[PDB]
Every structure is written in structure tokens, then in C-alpha cells.
């Protein structure tokens, strides 16, 4: 039951005393941040949201305000992922070196915040994963605390828009990021603009491709103005 | 007249019964009864029962079993053999009744062996329907579902596989498996509300009309997939799921004399 | 032989017959025979015949009648009652043979009563044709479909019925009994669909289920018509109106 | 009776008139009477007249001229100012009548000044003007015109008044006529040959064959911006389509017919 | 500075007023004010007022009445005759002002007759209100949308009208005269389309033309309803039923 | 001026040439020149030539051969090796020049060895070793259709596919393999009902150009086209949002 699960989670959390919470802006890291605040108090919980070139400014700006709106002291930290050569040249193991850079910045922040642990929201300690929470359990408990505001747009690293071996630059990341922002504002929350130098290859859930037709010409000109020469739609669909 | 009066009537009605057995579908109506019963009478006096049968999906049973747990109820699986009744097995027009009689005769049997005063279901506006007695409508159950912080119900109604077969067709493990595999395939493409109606060698797919435009990109995959499941012709009902529910005033009434012609 | 040799052969055989009855479908082959008969024997010695029946559309009949008249032929409609032969009514694989025997026996009566020497059809390079003595002069002169296209260009023929009408029999499974009502039901449904902008269409009969076949490349266009087609075909007697996901054939 | 007799009536009627002026649309019926007039009387006794106006496209005018020139007739272009009749300018329901009267009045003036005995049109207001529709006097039907057009080797022939794009009572101007014409031309160039851009002052109501509306979606934004730069504030698409009512079932065809 | 200080200011403002009339929309802002007013002054000192009028739908009214009752307030409906003011009836660009002016004069009349010290609305930190002297305690306490969210969560408030209503006046061109019949015609048309699955929609009135605004991403989905929509809006009184190629908020 | 005078001009020019070799594509323009050549000079003074090459489809070639024989001409196939010129093989913006040179240099030699006075092609109004009689007579696309209808010509190739070279970027080297890959992809797309199509080659990406008014119809074929062009060797199969050209 959920009452049994939350007792386990608070009990496990009650041991830690001082915590630093890696705050995504999603609901699971939202559950940990506000339940940690509930048991240890505002002054013993630090919410950290990472700002970097590989994720959107919107996801960062929404999560920063979402942590205060939960009542936490919140700290922005900026990671320079592109300064790791594995990330900069988009090797297939590059997810490893990026997560190595991220967890050491938060562990380094936890050392100077006098914290006993770094906490994350996976379904570093994932206490939500330890209490056997499902997406259903996190939904009942987050409403149960009156929580209504999370970033339900799950974002991935922009690295996945680039082929292995391609060098990421500030300019081509921005170009890909601006194209996906425009596509999202037309009503397509799940979208990918895959980068192939002068070709943009747009991935959409197949069930949306019919709805998309009315935007064909506007998307063509918009992504061309962002620097692509050819703007195309993958017939295979999203992933 | 107020939501509070309807809820107070329900708490009062529940308190008198003391020990209850809850027929738990997993939909919004029976979750309200299950979470209300636990709150006013406590975990030791409420048994949630979820039916498992050949006429329903494993996902429906498993999704409902896990909600009796997350709401905190003591929950019991009970399996019904609907296919052993000839009315159901040969899908006569009265089979809904014999299905509900066999269902309700098992929960009472369960109510005897746990000492409950009544079996409760979630029917709205020895089986009691407290929401019906408290004058809850579909709007009231939604409001009270928020007042209790309830977020998890089965959002699309799950219905007996019997409704996919014409009256007189005998249900078999093979043709039920065929219908269920076809709907599961369709749902995995992004169509949570779907029906694959069985007409021997013809499959007649019902989709909400607002989704049919999106479906075109899947025509060929759905055709070949349902053909390998045993249908020879895979077709799309032009009337859609729930024909007439969205029409204009002249033609929803002409489709209803059509649907009533049979 | 050359096309000129083939045309002279065809001119001679007609010039020999002096008076003819032409079975006129409207396709290119029967259009060629009809205009060669007129060119060689003149309007007064040629009678064009178009068969009218329950198994073909009124529309195809009117198009053949009017194409025969605009070619300059005297044209005559004749109505055949195909459902009175049980081989056709019971929709067996040999029903086309009994239909064409019924057709050629009506044409011979028309040639007898107008004094023509032969019935002509448009077959190019079939058992009921011979048993009734009709002649296929394009086939005797060794015309192939390219010879027909070639001679039709040289005579300036540009307008024939391109889409070949097929009998409504193909909308019913083999053995299913054809009745006036189930034929009318399918034909009204296909006529309604064609009037919406879908010239090539099949409404397959499955008793209470209608299964619509459309070219896949047109199904996107069809969406705006779902509700009208559903209710229209229901008022024609179908209980369920469906669209084949496989498409045309 | 027979096509040969119908042609005899028409050849006899033409030989009686001796010299004629022919109203030439460019369509098949006026091409037939123009070509029979040439065969029975020759170029010096036949004047083909092609009407130019604000209510038809310049392209239709130029194509009609070339078909009359291609048939071998002496062709005269006369341009009419239809908007100078107030019935036409303000689009009353009888405006078709005053348009045909002004047309037949210029044709009679042309025929009077070139010595023709009659004005001929291709019909299958005239009788106030004295105009003779010889195909109609010979009882020609659409099949007889097509049978005879082939017998004489006619293969090349070609429209509604722009008045039909405007509501009754709406005043036609040079500018709003041009606006409707350019809008329909732009749409035809996107691949939609059958189209109407109905004028409702600041609203454009586009009629399309319903079977094309799915194909049209990829053009929504371009059509909106193109027709706005042509002077409309709102660019809209009629959900009934082109010719509202003709593709529905017997029940909703008698629902949309009652609604008019 | 912090939400706690912002909440303290609002508690203070309410304790000074002692008795209030709350203009209740059903939205998150007016739900916060209604719940803090009930918490600080008690049920008998708070009147929730829900306005019913021709320019908003019966559902928006019935939902707002019912949302105020589930919060635990005494709520009274008051009906306004907006078409009475000629600025509203002939839909001038100033018509928003005369309607909000007529609304605030009804609220003061209710507050005067129940002994309330102020009429409260739900205005936050980002015209005719201050003329009648209504108070916007959320704006005075420096609440932003994030602060309204934080306090709504901490108070267990989860049930509001997440999408707010606009006056049906926006379906009419400036200068067009609103009547009882063409307002109803617009509202039944929009209700019918929403019942097809198009929750965000506008039927703009152009005498005999209906101009439907839809989010462009839904127009592909809409095609299957064309004839049904066309005939239904014709039975509601429009002669031509059209779809704006520009989309929603054209 | 009129179509009658434009046709008389063409009749006289043909009578002056007396014997001609006609470059026959199978389209409407070269179909008009071919029948008018046959009509004025007869089968024995007219040689129809259909070029067969790697840059045009075998389908267009088979139709042309059989269409000219059906028009009543003696027809000759001649095979060109466009890829043997390095300008064409490496797809420079110049390759049209060397392709048009190789084509007319082959056709003049056919005319030399059968003693005809000119090579005729189908260029209209709106390569100097060739006579474009339709262009000299002031034929427009409208004149060609009017004159083609007047003579009962009905059967030509309605869609002029052009050189497959344009499916490759400037600088890309054409191979037998990548040409066959593009040709097979366009053949498949044409067989689904899209006679006007381009599969632009971008190595591992296929970029399909379709007339925009057809893209709605295409949705039902996405997955089949994706898998079929992948089996032909493309890794990503895409649709240009710009449409055809
Ligand atoms: Ca189409
Ligand atoms: Ca959709």
C-alpha cells in the first residue's frame, strides 16, 4: 500500500538528516524534494537543478521556480558538458562521462552543503525506487500533498539528435534546440529534429503525422531560416 | 442537493453496514466506493474483490488488483467461469444477466465467509449501490473523486469481450483470444478506446471518429496483423465507436432508428 | 502483314456483308468496329446495339448509347433479363457463359428482324460467340491491342469508354444467390459512392455487412464522407457499413 | 426526326438569311453554328463576335478570339461595360437579364452596321432583340451538337459570370471584381480547377469540391495569407463545399435544401 | 518577500475587514481568496457571489456555484442584464468596461445589504474595479501566479476551473448589435463543437456566416465532422458555416 | 498567327527537308513532330530514333519504342553511354552540356548514314545541329495540344521524367549502383499511384519530393515506402516538406 510505502520512504529519509536533492522538475524529483522538506525542514534540504547546453532553458527555468514553489532553498549550477571530449565528439559512451560530470558536481555541492546524500527521482540514492513506487504510487502521493505543478514534458539530452562522431558545437545545438522549440509550439510535444548537416530529419509520433500537414510549408521555411537547407519528415516516425 | 449532503448520506449509509464487501472494477465509480468504505469503516472491515475471467483482459484484472493495494484495501482475486454457462457460452441476448447473476452469486458467497453485511458496487444515477442511493451522478462522482485526492482509475471503460460477438455466435478460447489480441495490437498503436467486432472472417474495427483520420497511416499494418490473427477481411466501421453520440440533431435520430432496426 | 493490310482485310469483310449489327459496349475495340462499319457501309446499313441489364449500371448504358450516336450510328437499346437463367442467378463460375449466350441470342434476333447479314463484336486476338454465329472481324484480321490503338488514331477516334464495366456479380461471393433486391442494394451504394468523386469503387456484399473497396491512394479523401456514406448505405438495407483496410482488390 | 434532317433545317435556315453575325462563346454549341455558317455562306457573310467584359476573365476572352480565328471567321471584339447598368452593378436577382439585354443590344448594333440579317447564338431576352438560335429551331440536343461537331471535324472548344461570387444587393466594383478573380486564379494554380471565392465584404468564403478538402490542408496558411494580401480580412472555407447539398444522402440533401 | 510574509499580509487584510463579499469566478485566484476568507473569518462572515448572465454559459455558472459550495461557502447567484447597457448591446470597444462596471455595482449592492466591509476579487500582481473600490488582496499582498500556486498547494486546494471563460461578446464584431437570439445561437454552436472533442473553439458571428476558429493542429481531425457541423449550425440559424484558414485567434 | 498557319509552316518545312530523322522521346511534343513527319513524308522517309541510356528509365524507353511503331514509324533504338563522359559521371553543373552534345552527335551520325536532311526534336516556343520545327512555327504548349487532338493523337507519356542526374548533388559521382538504387525507389513510388516523384539521393538519406497536393494521399503508404527503400539500401527514408521542386 501507499501508506506502507511512504512510511518506508520517510523512515529511510529520516536517517539522512541533511540532504541535497537533484531536482529534475519532473514529478518524481518533485515528490522527493517536498517530502524531504516535509521531514527535515527547509533549512536542511537543498534543491539543485542543473543548467547546461544539452537541455532546454525552459526546463531549467521551470524547475528552479518549481522548487521554490515547493518551498525549498534552490541553487542553480551550470555544467560545461561540451568540455569533456567524449561529450564534445558524441561518442557512444558519452552518456557515461556526462553523468560522471553531473554527479560529481552534486556530490561536490553536497560536501559543502553539509549534506549526507544526493537524492534523485528515478523510479546517488533513489529512495523512491527503494520504496517500490510505481508511476501510480507517485501520482496518488503527490496529489495527497496538494502537488499540482511539475514539468511533465520529459526531456532527453540533445546529444541524441546528433550522429555518433559528429562534433557538437554551441551553434548546431542551438539550431537543433530552436527547431524543436518551434515544432513544440505548434502542438507537438513529442518531437525530434535529427541533425544531418544540411538536412533536418523531423521525427514525429506516427499518429500525429496527419495533423502535421497544415504546417509543412511553415516548418520548411522556419527550419531553413535556422540554417538547414533541406527540411524533411522521417516516414518511420518517432524512434 | 449539495455534494456535501450526498457525501454525508454516503458516510451515514456506510457506517450502518459496518462490514462490507466491495465489487471493485477499477473504474472511477467503484474506486470511490472502495476509498469511501475504507475511510468510514477502516481497513479491517472492507474486502475488495476483483473478478478475473476469460471475458476480461489480464491488464484489467492486474490494473484493478494493484489499485485495491494502493488505496489500502484488503483485496482478493476471485475467478469466475462464465464460459460454463450456456447462455454466456452461446452469447444469447440475455447473457449479460446470467453473467451478472453468476458474478453476484460469488461475491455474496464471499460476503458470507468474511462476515460482511452487503456487497457494494459502483452503479450510479444482495447488492447495494450506495452512490445510486445517495443520488450521485457522473458529475458528482468526479467532484468527490477530487475531494478524496483520487487520481488513478481505469480511464477507458473495460467491457466484457462478449459485446464483440454477434448474438448466437458461440464464444471459444480461440475466438476470444483472437479478438483480444487484435484489440491489444490496436491499443499499442495509440488507440486506447477501440473495439474489434468479430464477424467470422470479417473484423469490424470501431474507433472514435475523432481518431479515424490519424488511423490512415496504420491501415496496412493493421490489415496484415489482424489477417495473421485469423481474419480474412479487416475493415473499419464507417459509423465509428458509439455511432450517433457525436452527430447533429437530424442524423443522430436517423442512426438510432437504424441501430434499433435490429 | 502490315496495319494497312489488316485494315484492307477488315474493309473487305464488311464490304462483303453489306448490312451489319454491331454489339456496342463503348470500349475501344467495339468503337473501332462501329466506326469502320459506318465508314465502309454507311449509316443506313449499320445498327448499333447496346445491352441493358440488371448486372450493369444505367450510367454505363447511357454512355454507350450516346457514344454510338455521336459516332454517327443508328443505335438501339435492348434489355436483357439475365436473372432468369439460373446459372447467372446462382452466381457460378460459368455464369458469364450463360450471360453471353443470352446476349448473342438477342442480337441474332435483332439482325434477323432488320436484315443484317451478321452480328459483329469487338474481340481482338469466347465459346458462346461461335455457337451463335457472331463474327469478330478485328480478330479475323489479326488485330492486336496495338493494331486497335493504331487504327483508332488514324481514324481520329479519341473518345471511348476507358474504364471497363464489370458485372455486379463480382460483388457477391461465388454461389451466393442474386436477387433483384441485393443487386439493387449494391448498385445504389456504388452509384452513391461514385457520385462523391470515387469513380473506381466496389461495395462487396456480406449480407448485413457492406465492405467498401477504394484505391488506397483515395482513402484519405474519403474521410469527409464517412457519416454520409454510413447512413446512406444503411438506409439501403445494410446494417454495418465498413471500409476495407486492404483497399481496392 | 434524324440528324441529317436537323442539319437540313439548319443549312436551309442559314441560306435564307444570307449574311449573319454570330455570337461566339468558344463553347461547342457556338462553335457548331459558327462553323456551319461558314460552310453555308463563306467568310464574307459571317462575322463572329466575341464579348469582353469585367465579368469574365481576360483569358476566356483571348481564348474565344483564337478559336474564332482558328475556325476561319472574321472576328470582332467588342467590350461591354456591364457595370453601367444599375441592376448589374448592385447585383439584383434579375441582373442576368439586363446583362443579356446589353449584350444582345451591342450585337444587334454590330449586325445592323455590317449588313447582317440576324444575330445567331448557340442556344439549344433574345426574342426582344430578334436573335435567332438556329440550333434550337432545328431541335438540336447536346448529342446532336456533338454528333455533328465530330462529323465536321471540330475538336477544339472551351464559365460563369463573376456576379455569382457576390451576394444579391452587394455592389460590384472594379476592385472587388479583380479581388475575386485573382483569388480564384491563385487557387486554380495550386491544383484546384473547380473553385469559387465567394465575396462577403471582409470575409472570403472558399467553395471547393469536398473530395479535395483533405488535399487542401497543406495550403491553408498560404491561401490565408495570399487572400489577405488581396484585400480580405478573413479567409474561410465553406464546410458545405462547392455546390452545397448535391453529395448528401436523401435525408440530409432534403435538410440542406429546406435550409436555403 | 517569502510566501509566508505574503500570506501574513493577506490574513491581516482579511482580519481587518471582518466581513466580506467575494466575487467568485471558480478560478484558482478566486478559489484562494474564498478559502483564505473562510479560514480567517468563518462561514457566516463570507458571501461568495456568482454572476449569471447572457454573456457566459450556464455550465460556467453551475460549475462556479458548485465549486464555491464544495469549498464550504455560502454562495448566492446574482443575475446581471448586460444587454441593458447600450455600450454592451451595440458592442463598442468600450463594452468590457461598462460590463465590469455593472458587475461591480451589483457586488457593492450585495455587500452593502449583508454588512460586508469590502467586495473582493481574485486579481493578482500581474480599471472599473478600483472605481467601485473592490479590493484585490492577492495583488496587495504581492502574490504572483507562482505564489498563488504555492499557497494553493500548501492549503490542499486542488479543484479550480483550469480554463477561464471569455465573454461571448468577443464572437461579435465591434458595432454588431448583440441580441438574445444571436448570443444563444453562438453558444449552442460552440457547445456542439466542444461535444465533438474540440474544447478550444470559437464560433465568430458574421450575421449569416459562422466563422469557426480551431487550433490548426486539430483541423485535420475535424474533417470527419464537416457535414455534421455544417448542417447543425445551419439548423441553429446561420446560412453559411465556414472554417477560418487562419486558425484559433486568427 | 493561327494554328492553321502554324501547321502550314510546319508542312512546308517538312516538304523542303524531304527525308528526316526524328529524336523521339515519347512525350507530346515529339509525338506531334513524329506524326506530322509521317503524315507529310510517309513511313519510308521518316526514321524515329529512341535513345536508351542509364539516366532514363527502361519504362520510358519501352513505351517510346512501341509508341512510335504504333504511330506508323520505322523506329530504331540507339544506346548512349552518358557515364563515359567524366563531366556527366562526376555530375558537374556542366554535365547537361556534354550529355546534350553526346546525344546530338549520335543522332547526326544516324542521319548521315540514312541520308536524311535533318535531325528533328520536339522543342517548342517558351544544339544547332538539329531542327526544332515546332519552335520555328511558333508552337506553344497550347498549340501542340490543339494540333495533337485534331490529328487523333491520344497515347503519349504524360509525365516527362527527366535525367536521373538531378537526383544527385552537384559533385556526387554517379555509379551504376546508386543510379539503380534511385531508379528502383522511384519505380516503387510510381507504382503506388504517384507518377510525379523524385527520390533525391543524400547517401544514406532518401529525400522524397512529391507534389504537395499529393502528400495527404501518401500517408497510407509511409511504412511500406520506408521499408521498401530501406531494403534498397537507404538508412533513413524522408519526405521533403517543400514538395516537388
Ligand atoms: Ca487526394
Ligand atoms: Ca489527430
Question: Mind explaining what this structure looks like?
Answer:
The structure is a homohexamer. Chain A has 239 residues and is of the alpha/beta class. Chain A has two domains: 1-156, no CATH class; 157-239, no CATH class. In chain A, 45% of the residues lie in helices and 15% in strands. The first copy, chain A, is built from ten helices and seven strands. Chain A is globular, with a radius of gyration of 20 Å. In chain A, 41% of the residues are buried. Chains in contact: A-B, A-D, A-E, A-F, B-C, B-D, B-E, B-F, C-D, C-E, C-F, D-E, D-F. Chain A binds chain D through residues 213-218, and chain D through 217-218, 220-222. Strand 8 (233-237) of chain B pairs antiparallel with strand 7 (240-244) of chain C. The structure holds calcium ion (CA) (2 copies). The site of one calcium ion has 2 residues of chain F, from helix 9. The PDB classes it as transferase.
Global Rg of chain A:
20 Å
Structural class of chain A: alpha/beta
Q: Helix content range of the residues of chain A, please?
A: 40-55%
- Secondary structure tally, helices of chain A: 10
Query: Strands of the biggest beta sheet of chain A: in what spatial order?
Result: 3-2-1-4
When the domains of chain A are counted, the total is: 2
Oligomeric status: homohexamer
Span from first to last CA of chain A? 35 Å
How is the biggest beta sheet of chain A arranged?
Answer: 4 strands, parallel
Overall geometry of chain A: globular
Return the string of H and E elements of chain A. Answer: HEHEHEHHEHHHEEHHE
Amino acid at each position: 500500500t501507499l501508506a506502507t510505502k511512504k512510511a518506508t520512504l520517510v523512515a529511510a529519509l529520516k536517517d539522512l538528516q541533511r540532504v541535497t536533492v537533484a531536482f529534475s522538475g519532473g514529478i518524481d524529483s518533485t515528490l522527493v524534494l517536498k517530502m524531504a522538506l516535509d521531514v527535515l525542514g527547509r533549512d536542511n534540504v537543498t534543491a539543485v537543478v542543473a543548467n547546461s547546453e544539452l537541455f532546454t532553458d525552459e526546463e531549467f527555468d521551470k524547475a528552479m521556480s518549481l522548487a521554490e514553489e515547493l518551498g525549498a532553498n534552490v541553487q542553480g549550477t551550470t555544467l560545461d558538458y561540451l568540455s569533456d571530449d567524449h561529450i564534445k565528439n558524441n561518442t557512444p559512451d558519452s552518456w557515461y562521462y556526462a553523468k560522471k560530470m553531473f554527479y560529481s558536481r552534486l556530490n561536490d555541492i553536497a560536501a559543502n552543503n553539509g549534506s549526507a546524500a544526493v537524492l534523485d527521482g528515478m523510479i546517488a540514492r533513489s529512495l523512491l525506487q527503494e520504496a517500490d513506487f510505481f508511476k501510480t504510487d507517485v501520482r496518488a502521493l503527490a496529489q495527497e500533498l496538494g502537488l499540482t505543478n511539475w514539468n511533465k514534458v520529459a526531456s532527453c539530452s540533445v546529444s541524441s539528435r546528433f550522429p555518433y562522431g559528429t562534433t557538437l558545437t554551441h551553434d548546431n545545438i542551438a539550431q537543433v534546440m530552436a527547431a524543436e522549440k518551434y515544432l513544440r509550439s505548434l502542438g507537438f510535444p513529442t518531437v525530434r529534429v535529427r541533425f544531418h548537416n544540411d538536412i533536418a530529419r523531423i521525427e514525429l509520433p506516427e499518429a500525429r503525422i496527419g495533423d502535421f500537414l497544415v504546417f509543412n510549408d511553415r516548418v520548411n521555411r522556419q527550419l531553413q531560416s535556422l540554417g538547414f537547407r533541406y527540411v524533411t519528415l522521417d516516414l518511420g516516425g518517432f524512434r
